[PDB]
Amino acid sequence: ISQLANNWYMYFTDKRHETTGKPKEIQDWRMRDRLKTVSAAIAVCLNKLEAWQDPTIPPVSKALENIGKALQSQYETLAIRTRCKQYLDPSIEETKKFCISLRRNAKDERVLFHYNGHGVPKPTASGEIWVFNKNYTQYIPVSLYDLQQWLQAPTIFVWDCSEAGNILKNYHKFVERHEKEEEEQSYEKVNFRPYIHLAACASKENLPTNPMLPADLFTCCLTTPIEMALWFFVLQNPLKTKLTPERARKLGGRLQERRTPLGELNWIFTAITDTIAWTTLPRDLFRKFFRQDLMVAALFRNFLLAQRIMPVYGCHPQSYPELPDTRRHPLWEAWDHAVDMALAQLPMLYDYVPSTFFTEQLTAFEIYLTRGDAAAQKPPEQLPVVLQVLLSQQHRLRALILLGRFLDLGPWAVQLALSIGIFPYVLKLLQSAAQELKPVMVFIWTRILAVDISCQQDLIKDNGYTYFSSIMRPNETIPVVGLSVIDEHKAMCAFILSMLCKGFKTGQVVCNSTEIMTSCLYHTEHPDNPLLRQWSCLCISQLWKDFNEAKWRGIRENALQKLAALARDSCPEVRAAMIHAMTTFLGIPEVTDEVARLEEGIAWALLEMATDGSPIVRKELLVFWSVFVLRYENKFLVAAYEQLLEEKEYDSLYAAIWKHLCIMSVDPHPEVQRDATTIVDYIHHALLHSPVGTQAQTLMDEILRAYHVAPEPLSPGYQERKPTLPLVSTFLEWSTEYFREPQMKTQPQKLYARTHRWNNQIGLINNGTQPSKMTFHQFENCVAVADDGNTITVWDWKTNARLSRFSNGNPEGTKISDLCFINEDDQALLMTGSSDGVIRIYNNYDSDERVELASAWRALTHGMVFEWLQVNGRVLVAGDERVIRIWSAGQEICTHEIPARSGSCVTSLTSDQMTGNIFVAGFGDGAIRVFDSRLRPHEAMVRKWKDDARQWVRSVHMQRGGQRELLSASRNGKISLWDIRMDQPLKTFQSTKEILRTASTHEHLPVFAVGTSAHMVKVFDFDGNELTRLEPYSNFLQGSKASPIATTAFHPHRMILGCASRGDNYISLYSCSNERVPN
């Protein structure tokens, strides 16, 4: 009962049964417009402090030189690519010279023009700005038109002057002149198109004046933001620190070392400003300005600080792409905190104490995931901070885990992460030696590749293949760390590598240099991970798809044999994957004797698999044979002709393949039938157009020499065409969906019925045609009714609803042998066995138009009876063959095949529904045989009983659930009750003198019934005595022998009994009334 309490699954509700092929894709995210800012001109004009330098020092020209060099270094530290020149009190001639020079040196690339107008007068409310004159005496203006003719194509403008706003106003018209001007002309235009402005003041404001403030304030913001922010903080919070603003500036550390107070502050600043922008403006602008170029983004980021600081002291800065004001974004408070604490730690010779900002922010991200709008795909606020953290040796682990959880949400989150800029970080981390990361890295990369396979390129170039191959090696044990809920550890590596080789020959080559193939082959052989086996086969399939050196490598490691081992694997998805590996292998162009020998061996090995129960697998087999038939078309034409001639009078392998192709052109699953027919039809249309007109003749020669009533349902997603053969395989595209879907988240009552009289007609149902068989749902109030021929009706015996009517799809002249409800707990489905040997199972039995066909397979090869074990996940099928087959609904393969000894047929079966182990079959010669599944075949025979009268066994029931009670009715009427151990029947008594058509047994109540040959059903107790005799309403008179009872069916729990006679199609329902039995 430990096994019994562990193995009790449900058996036809997997992705491979609610679909069979992929249903229904990313939006652009990478950075194409990659253009650098190459060079910078820093024009200062002067003659409050500047550039952290005191002017007015007795070497005044030396101070004016230092103000230049300071600005040069300050700009160089923002975007070290840009080369920067400073120009000190320039003459207008000099300015035109360098501007034209700048635009020549940076042909087509962005350029920075900085302007410091402290010593000259304010720009006029025209385009003109002021310079010095040659001789360094007078102030000359410079109109924008001339400047634009110097600084033509992409440019950034920095204006540290008063009334800068006017410069922005009248710049647009001066452009439109040039634009039309340059449009007037046959030569190449001058573009003027991409210009960007950053100004300190608005139209009419004035740069501030008071001391405790430098003159170059906006320059301070945009070129030394951390020092300026520390300074500004000491001004605004002097009661938090007893420091000079001059001293905060000189905070110990280094800007590009996050480990020092200053560097940490810089990093926190970057995170805060980045998220501020991410929040307050749309993705378009965010990506175009804060992600395109280092210099541009640096200045916009620092311009957010400018937006915060400048209006404290008057003017409000402007910017050509106009950004919202951003002044009071709440994150600034965090900044102040992070600043305060850092300043609080300014001793000197002790360990520095990092600001908690980052772990606090990641915790905010965690909560964002755990609830709320994350399900509604509102973008997280923290994401840029998480990206920032990925650097931190300290916090990167939690950041990565949270990122993984974010990406698990679905494809949209991968899209979002990619566009914010996750990609380079997760490429860089592939270099880290830390084994903590490896599993998180694997998960992240699978979720990325599953939604944008172009990354396969970068991964191959940045040596990712070695990272994941090393993780997948057979002896490699990876440390589980964190909330690594995912147990599918290496199989993800297999999937990653498969995607590295999908398309992408260069990936196929690189990976064939490595040990990948060998590891995949190893995982095929050794047990316990089905996903790993699957994706190892898929990896092989993609590893050699059109790469000959890889196919030869596989042969060198006998890949083909190791793959053919899996022909009978536990898991159908593995079987399909293996078939797809073989189908890709087919193709070696030099068709040597060796090569066709190998491919014939393949086809031989897979020939076995034509019988397995999984339509997924048979569909892949037909794909493989599509390809294989095209390869050897000649052999198949000869075999197809052969079979025609051998049907008229009515090379070995190819005949068997053709035979199974024809068989599968009737496979009951519609998709399998469709594929198999199209193959056969292609070969026939090639045999006619072959140099054999004999064909058309022989084909025509052979041609000359209560059914189909309701709609038959079809497998989910079935298409409809209006044949080009080589068949498209959907199995990889389907298999890779897994990594786009989330993966982390009553004794007294017995004696009532033993006494009372079953005469109470609870209901009467008018079926379509005369019922053959029926069965009752354990819990739901519905009854399934199989007609004569191919029809099924599902009624609600309370309210007589007719929940559904659909046709079982039997061929004409074949009836339905039994019905089972399976998975009666939580997802009920309907089984049907057809005399022709096919089992079908239906997914939404209780709804019309919503009814699907989950699976369907031919259970008997060359009617039938079948018993369903839910405990065991088993279908025992016996028929006119000398074998009782046992199919595992778990594997969809015929797990066992026991031989029944009798040359006579098997007429019915049962087993105990709780151990699921031993079953009993009645036979046509009167015999009854009990077998145990556990044993050897040929020793499974455990007990033979043999009717002396040698009379057909109508039925045999083991009502487990109720009691250890085994009952067998005979055609003549003797009803024996056996103990499986002992030699003799416990009891045995006649039920009717006339012929016994039906014999039901109730599962819990100790009562059974028999339908007699003359329109009567007698309901007996297990001790012989009859609890009632009954005649179900019919048009044929009293005991008219022209309507023998066709079926008798107990409800499993309720005290109900159902009857249907032959002539009528009325299903009568009875239950106990208040009379007793005289007894």
Tab-separated table of C-alpha atoms in Angstrom, residues 93 177 340 605 624 670 742 899 906 950 1031 1066:
chain	number	residue	atom	x	y	z
A	93	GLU	CA	38.454	82.820	-36.368
A	177	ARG	CA	17.194	77.145	-44.120
A	340	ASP	CA	24.639	60.816	4.077
A	605	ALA	CA	15.499	-0.745	-36.037
A	624	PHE	CA	11.315	9.564	-41.091
A	670	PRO	CA	-6.525	11.167	-37.986
A	742	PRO	CA	6.824	28.750	-16.742
A	899	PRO	CA	-0.299	-16.222	-23.764
A	906	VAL	CA	-11.296	-14.852	-24.664
A	950	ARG	CA	-18.209	-26.602	-22.079
A	1031	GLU	CA	-39.646	-6.599	-17.700
A	1066	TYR	CA	-35.227	2.695	-24.386
